[PDB]
Structure formats: C-alpha cells, structure tokens
Amino acid sequence: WXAXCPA
Amino acid sequence: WXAXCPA
Amino acid sequence: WXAXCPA
Amino acid sequence: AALVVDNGSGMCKAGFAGDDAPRAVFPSIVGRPRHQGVMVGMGQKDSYVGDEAQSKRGILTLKYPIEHGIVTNWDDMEKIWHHTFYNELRVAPEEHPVLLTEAPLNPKANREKMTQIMFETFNTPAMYVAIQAVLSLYASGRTTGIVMDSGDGVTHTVPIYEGYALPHAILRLDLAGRDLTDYLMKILTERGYSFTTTAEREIVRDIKEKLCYVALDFEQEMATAASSSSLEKSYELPDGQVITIGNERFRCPEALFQPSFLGMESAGIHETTFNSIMKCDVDIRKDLYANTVLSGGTTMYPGIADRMQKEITALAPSTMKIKIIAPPERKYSVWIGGSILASLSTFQQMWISKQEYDESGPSIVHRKCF
Amino acid sequence: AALVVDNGSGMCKAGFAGDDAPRAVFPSIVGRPRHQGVMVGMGQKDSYVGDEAQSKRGILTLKYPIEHGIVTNWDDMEKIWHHTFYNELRVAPEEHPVLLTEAPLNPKANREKMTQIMFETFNTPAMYVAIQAVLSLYASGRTTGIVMDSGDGVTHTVPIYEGYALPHAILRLDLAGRDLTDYLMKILTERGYSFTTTAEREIVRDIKEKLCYVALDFEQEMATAASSSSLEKSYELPDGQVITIGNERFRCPEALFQPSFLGMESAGIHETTFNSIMKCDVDIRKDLYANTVLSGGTTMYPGIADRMQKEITALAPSTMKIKIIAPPERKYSVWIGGSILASLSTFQQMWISKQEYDESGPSIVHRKCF
Amino acid sequence: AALVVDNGSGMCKAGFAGDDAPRAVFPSIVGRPRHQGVMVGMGQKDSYVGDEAQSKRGILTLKYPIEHGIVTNWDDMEKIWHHTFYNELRVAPEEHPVLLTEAPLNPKANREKMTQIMFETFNTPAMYVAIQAVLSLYASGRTTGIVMDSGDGVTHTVPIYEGYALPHAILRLDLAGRDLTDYLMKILTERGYSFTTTAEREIVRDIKEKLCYVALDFEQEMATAASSSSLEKSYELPDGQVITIGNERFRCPEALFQPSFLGMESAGIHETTFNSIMKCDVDIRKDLYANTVLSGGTTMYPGIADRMQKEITALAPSTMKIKIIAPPERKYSVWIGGSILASLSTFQQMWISKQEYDESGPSIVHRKCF
Ligand SMILES: Nc1ncnc2c1ncn2[C@@H]1O[C@H](COP(=O)(O)OP(=O)(O)O)[C@@H](O)[C@H]1O
Ligand SMILES: Nc1ncnc2c1ncn2[C@@H]1O[C@H](COP(=O)(O)OP(=O)(O)O)[C@@H](O)[C@H]1O
Ligand SMILES: Nc1ncnc2c1ncn2[C@@H]1O[C@H](COP(=O)(O)OP(=O)(O)O)[C@@H](O)[C@H]1O
C-alpha cells in the first residue's frame, strides 16, 4: 500500500 | 548451517 | 603474478 | 464462449465458461536473470513467466507483481496476461468477453487500471469484475452463507445472505499463506536450516503444502512433541539433503488463530469470523452459522475444519449450531463458480461494452461492477 | 567479579565486570601444523590458539571455529575458552558468574551446547546469554533506537523501543567482513596479485583495515579513479614487497550496499535497515529514525556514516531528519555494554543457577534467555 | 574464414573455423642456445620456436613464455604467434578475424596487452577473446553443467546453468600438469634416476603421458605395490637406457586429489568442484550433478573419471546419481568448441572491430568481453 503495509 | 550456507 | 606465486 | 481468468496473489488460473476444470495452471511469477548471458546459442529471453521460470528458478530473481491482492507492478502484470492468452490459452482476446476476480476492500486504483488495460491492450469485446469470495459460494451451490477465503495475500471474511453480499460486514485480514511462508523459515532456522532468497522460498512453499497440519489442541500437542519421535518427518531437498522437522509441523498453521506470534494485533482467523457475523442482523445469524464455507489454498491443511469448528463453538453460544462446509475441490472454487456465472444467460446483460467504456472512461467500473 | 566474554566469529574479547576496556584482546583462531616437526629440542605443541597462532601463521593451517556466528567445531570451541580463563585472564571460572553473547536468529542447539559445556567442564556459579545487538545500546546509554551490528560473520539489525524488543522485525544478513575479505581477494587478482592460502587471508584482512574506505558517490568515483592516480595507495607486505591499490579501495566496501557483485540476492545494508523499520509500525518509526546506532568492526570504514545517512535519506521521507550515531569506540560497544549489565544490581536475579540447570538441563536457557 | 588460435600454458593449437581438428599442433616453447657456434653460419637463428626447438631441445635453454595462463614475457610470445601465421598455417592474418582463449580470473593487464599488439602488429580486422571453459561445453553440445578445464598451467571450474555463468562461483586452482611434472621431478630421485635441466624435464613430460594412471584407491594400491612387482613398467630413455617405475605411477595423479604432498594449502580437484557447486544455488545443484564436463590434457590419465566419480558420491548425498562426461576427444575440446562459435552467424555481431579499438583503446576488451 501507500500509507501502510508494503503494498 | 545444515541446510543452506556452509554453517 | 607479482606478489604471490611466480607468475 | 467467455474466458474466465482469476488473478491470484501467487497462483493464477484460466479456462473456459462451462468447464469443470481450469485450462491453465501455472503460478504468477516473473523473474529476471541477475547473471549475465555468456552463451548465444539459445534465445535467452529477457524475462520468463509462469512454469517457465520455476524450471529455471535458480538463476532468476523471482518477483510477485501482486501483493496482498494489489497489483504493485503493472508493467510485469501485462506479461502474465499476454502469456496466458497467447501461450497457455492460445486464443485471441478480441473475440471473447473475459471476466476477472478481485478481493474485497481493494484500492480504487487497482480495479480501474485493469479495465483500462483490457479495453486498450487486448481490446476484449466485454469485461466484468467480480469479488473473489462471493464466487466461491456459488461453487458450493448456496446463496445464503459466509465464505472463508484464504489465499496468499488476503484473508477476507464476507457473509452472503442473498444474491449480493453485505459490504458493511466484510472483514479483510492481510494474514495468509505467504505470511506463513515467512513464518516457518524464521522458526526453521532454529533447526539449523537457512533459507533467505526467493528461489528457496518456493522450496519453503513446498514443505508447507505437504507436511504442515493443524493441531486440534496446541497446548496438548506441544507437550506431546516434548517427548520426541512419533511426529518428526523426513523431507528431501532438491539438493538431495534430507531434513527433519519436529514441533514446527503444527506451530506455523497454528499462527492463524494466534497472530501474536507474527506480531500484528489482529485477532485469529477463528475470532474474525465471530466479529463479522455479529455485524449482521439477528435473524440472518442463524442461517450463517450453519452455512460456513472455507475456501482458498490456505484452508487445505488437514484437520483445519475440525479445530475451526471447536474454536467457534467455544465463542458462539451453544443454542445455535455450527456446521463447517469443506468441499474437496475448494482449491478452485473461485474459478469454478465463475464458470457457472459466465455460463448463465442472465449475465449477458451485466457485461460491459467497449462503447460504454469509451463514453465513461475507466471510471465506469465503480458504478457497474461490484 | 563476573566475567564478560563475547565470543565472535573472528574476534573475541574477554574482561571483568565494571571495567571500561576488555582485558584480553586476541584473535579467535585455532591452527595446527601441516608439516612434521624436525627439531626435538623446541617444545612443539599440538595446536596453537590466539596471537600465538598469528605469530606462526605462516606454518599453521588456521581455522575459524565459529562461522557466521555459529560454532561449527565444538571441540575447538572448548580450547579457546580453556586458553582464555587460564592463560589470558588467569582466573578460575568456578567462583565467578560469566556472561556470554550471541547473534539473534541462531539455532537453539547452538546455545544449548554452550550452557552444557560451561556448566560441566568449568562448573561456573552462573551464566547469562544475551543478544550482541542488545548489549550494543547499553554502551550508548540510550533506551530506544535501531542498532546495526555488522560483525565478522553476522550482520544483524534489531529494533528496540523503550526497552521492549520486536522479534518479528529482526533481520539477519549473512554478509559481513569475512565475506568482504573473500571479495577483496578476488578483486585484487585483476592487478596481478594472488592470495589463496588461509594464511594469506590475514594479510588481506590487514590491507582493508587501513586503506579501504567508503566513497560518497560510487558512480562519480570510478570515473575519477579511472582518470587519475591520486586515489592510489602503496602498502608494504611483511616480506618487503610493496603493494599499490587503485579503484579497489572503494569497490570492496561498496559491496555492503550492492551485494549483487557477490551474487547474493539480499538487500543492501542501507535497504535492510530501511526494510527492518518498515516492518515496525508507524508510531515508533519517527523515534527510531533519529536513533540509528552502528556497531561492529565492519563499520570501522571511513565515511561509512555519510554514505549510510545519504542512502537512507532517499528511501526515508524527506520531512524526517535522519541522525546517525557513530561513537568513536563502537568497536568494543558490545563488550563495554556487557560490563554495565554485569555491574547492574537488578541483573543478579536473572543469573541461571546450577540448581536450575540441574533440575531441567540445557533446555532452561530457551525460556530464561532471549 | 575466421582464425582460431588457442594459446595454452603448455600447448598451443591453431586452425580454421568450421573444421574438426586443429590444423597446426606444435608446442608452446621458445628457447635459445647457451653455447657458441664453432662452425660456419648455415642458418643458426637467434631463437627457435615450435617443434623446431623440440628437435634440438638438447642444446637450447627451453623457457615457456606462458606460465599459469599468464604471459611472463611478451617478447617471446610475439615469436610464437608470428611463427604460427607464417610457418604453420601459412595465411596472412590481415584478412580474417582471430579468436583467443583466456582463463578466468586473470589480471586485466594480460588481456589488454594481447589486444593492443594484435591490432598494431598483425592488424587483424576483428578480434574476440573467450573463456576456455565456456568453449569446452560448446564442444559437448550441451547447455547446462560444470566444466573441469585442467591444462598445463591452470585448473579452473566454471559452472553454467542454461547459458548463464555465475561469476562468483568460479574457483581457480593453480595446480596443473606442470606442477605434476615437478612433483615427479622430486619423487623419481628415490629410485636413482636424476634429472636436472628443463630440457630433461620434457622427458618426464613423456613418461607421465604413457605410464602414469589413476588408481581406484590409494591405500590398497600402495600396500599392493609394496608387496609385489605387478605394477612395474619399463620406460626407455632417448639415449637407449631403460628405467622402471613402480608405485609412482599412481602417486602423481593422486596428487591432484591430495595436494598436501606438494605442500599447497589448497584442496584437491575433487574437493574444489564440491566447493563450487555448493557455492551455486540449491535449485540448480540437481542438474549440474549429472552434467559434469571434463576437459584438459591433465585428465588424460586412465581411470580418472572412475576415481573422480567416487569421492563426489562420498561428499554429495547418496540420493543423487553422479555422471562424469568424458568424451574421448576432450583434449582439443576447447579448440573444437571455439571452432563452432566462429561458424555461428550470431557471433558475427559481437566482433571487436578495428575502429572500436581505435576510438577506445585497449580498455574496450574489458567492456566487450566477459
Ligand atoms: N496441499 C496444500 N497444503 C497447504 N497449503 C497449500 C496446498 N496447496 C496450496 N496451498 C497454498 O495455497 C496458496 C494458493 O492458493 P489459491 O488461493 O488457490 O491461489 P491464490 O492464493 O494465488 O489465489 C499457495 O500459496 C499455497 O501455499
Ligand atoms: N579498522 C578497520 N577497518 C576495516 N575493517 C575492520 C577494522 N577493524 C576491524 N575490521 C573488521 O571487522 C570485523 C569484525 O571485527 P570485530 O567486531 O572486532 O569482531 P567480531 O565481529 O567478532 O565482534 C573483522 O573481521 C575485521 O576484519
Ligand atoms: N595422454 C596424456 N597423458 C597424460 N598427460 C597428458 C596427455 N596428453 C597431454 N597431457 C598433458 O596435459 C597438459 C595439458 O594439455 P593440453 O590441455 O592439451 O595443453 P594446454 O594446457 O596448453 O591446453 C600438457 O602439458 C600435457 O603434458
């Protein structure tokens, strides 16, 4: 992700 | 190591 | 070689 | 005919509508050779996709274009799609509508880009976008139940009472088999086996699929494992070395119900089922208890249903009955359900037209597809 | 009068509690002659350990009993400890507790063996086994911060926040100075210089410790290095012959950031440090950004802090200020941090007793030490 | 008609592209008289090169311009290549491109010098330098495996998987036939035969090619050889004297497996292959176990393949099968390997044009060659 996790 | 690397 | 062996 | 493609985090399948088995079965990985080509005799292609890579996976930098059900790399993604249609399925996309499946609670940018790609790269006559888990319930021949999907990037729980699912009670958890693969290896280092690269990660993937199992009583089983023997199994590595694994056979699958071992505060997979069914109406709760369905390749562990049934029983009040449905071929339920939906005559009106996409751009997917 | 010994892959330091510097500073190598003795007058021994081996390294076959922070030869492992207590420290371990260090993510059998051998061969009052990276922060005196311990065989990074560790975010890299010695020796050959035997590894270990340095911009430098000779340095071998090295001065330490030269698929030390803190949650990342601690003899390189801060700056958000902590004495931080713990009054309750080991055995360390 | 020229540490082979056997096969020696010609000058040149020196080796001082795959005298080398084109193959080299073979891990100074002169002295239209081991696999017609190239000066093993070679796992051993002759030069003195000069060393080169062989097991053979005379062989000296050698027949080829007799801290060729394959990835170890390619004039010994197979099975896991590929014509495998590349239309693209050398200099070889 963008804000959070890696994705 | 036993499995993987030399250690 | 230069330093090490003779080659 | 209409094509059915079900992109997954690690495993992607494709076939034809009405078929009982997907035509193409190959993992969705693209790798690039880190080393430099020395020989010019063969092609030595720039990149390899699918089963081609795993055959030569020792010398490739394997990358997963989709992470947690989100396509991180769009440049690599079209390589799979091009490979699927021309190499495996060997059909021209511009004659047949194709359907794609997605996890719930995905970013809007994920499912708008694919529609742009479909109508600009492959020029498919029609398209559709359907949630991964809802199609699984269709494969079981039910329309009132809750589906436990668990793949590689997403573990989402969704209750479905009618032909459409409830969006408000959808609980999505980013704990799946790929996290499990990362978890056994750090624990496997306790026994002296080191696996760091992505090439050996698939070797790590193999041992989980064969030896890992769910223990009914984690506390009792670990005490049993303290006595040694009767549980250690021998597995042969592709190198040739044989490794033995003790308590780790059940410890890694156990992490589903106790995520505290992996360091995220979310509750176990058994618990999130209870939360989702609390968010729905009281009357619908009775039906969903008796219609619990497991799906996804993670749920393949032996005894996973029995321990699951025990755990929910303790949390749920004893009045309502819990029956867990585990069909033998739940591995491909997402695709199989899509084949049924594609074969339906009513679905000819829920296709999206190329002309309709032109008038509204890629934003039509939010309003039409669900 | 507790004993603080920190066995390392190549270097071990032994001293006393409450001191500021390790008492004994000698290499951790056991070697045996490959020839047969001729003169009977001189009292030849069987094997030589420590600086004595270094004095006669030209005749011995030096071997490292510890590889990648793992004891691959437990017989030799007793020999070094036998030499430490009775030759270097000249004290009896039977009356003082002794503390030992180890890298994280090590096999449990490795720490199982050390407890058994020391309680049965030397019969100490007590032991404690603690993570090398953990002891590093004590020397700094802080309470929160990411510690980068790049020793000789293990490169590991551990996040700490207010004294609470995060086991899930701990990342271990098996790329450290010994591998760099192997990389330095293959890249010296292009100038015409051959170093093959194990005794010729130490001379290569000497050349890097004085002339090798970290360049701020690798891409800028090789063009400068290939355009002049100002970067060339001259070194004299013990046999009298003199060595000149050019661009290789910065290329060898560059592998710490570009392991692709070694063929390893792991991320760079800057990337792994970035990757480790990404595994942590958002809340502590700000504090952990400003408390980056470097340690280990590998980090002795001049200009390494400037390169690490520059590399992390690109990956980290621009708003944050990255602060690299580089105390001048960081080579001995692990031991010096150990002196504090043995001197702490609260620490006396966490000593493992002989009675505790007697009732349970070697397995007591797993539940009593992290 | 591209020109293939193979400068070897002990033996140089040259021919034409597309052929099966080298056209001109003459030794790589340059010698000069150590005395004065009392008789008139009926053609006493300054130096004799090639088979001419071999005919009159008793008067000249034989010196190899090539040593350990490294040119120690660039003057005498120009003589052999000048003699090659105008006395052996009788072709002008200004009209055809030339191929050269270089051992891996050689100093950059060697390979830049051969290029600089050939573009300036013989003015070749095009040029290319290839690895000796790489061309050896080409002769076998395979695509994956590890090649053992042990010539007169160097022994190097280069593993390749599907046309991709791993530069990190390349192990170079400075143990070859010339050392084996020197070991014979030391052990033959026990039976009374004393050879001193380098011209007399050529006789030792002959006896090893006719009587030396690889024994299946050293320990039983030495016991058997010390109990009987069945292993005795008679060799005739050029002067008419006859010599007999017993246990030394198998002792010299045994040194390739136990270099401790020569005092070298390196390990045997069987062990070195094990290190290289262990350094390779786990996923590719299966394929290269059955694809071991043997080359070089050193391994002409009878029974070497049977012996070579034995220790590898001991070191490797018993599950995997071991195959040693030993083509009968592995002696000139590099030449025939280099022959087919010159015949490939694809290779015409990668020719080093004269203009490219002019605009860049001798540094182009590093960028345009592996
Ligand atoms: N026999 C098995 N036992 C345990 N896990 C399995 C088994 N077979 C497959 N899996 C897991 O299922 C995952 C893929 O399942 P699936 O949902 O069909 O694909 P995707 O997750 O890509 O949609 C794999 O990552 C694998 O770890
Ligand atoms: N001044 C220096 N410059 C570069 N490298 C060094 C320097 N001093 C030590 N090293 C390297 O750092 C490695 C680890 O040193 P040290 O931390 O003392 O041992 P250990 O890793 O056992 O704690 C050694 O192998 C050494 O080669
Ligand atoms: N039949 C044989 N038996 C034993 N040794 C041989 C035999 N033929 C050649 N040799 C030795 O092998 C060495 C290397 O041979 P070759 O590979 O043809 O030359 P180069 O090393 O120049 O490529 C030579 O020095 C030669 O003495």
Ligand SMILES: [Mg+2]
């Ligand atoms: Mg799935």
Ligand SMILES: [Mg+2]
């Ligand atoms: Mg260290």
Ligand SMILES: [Mg+2]
């Ligand atoms: Mg050769």
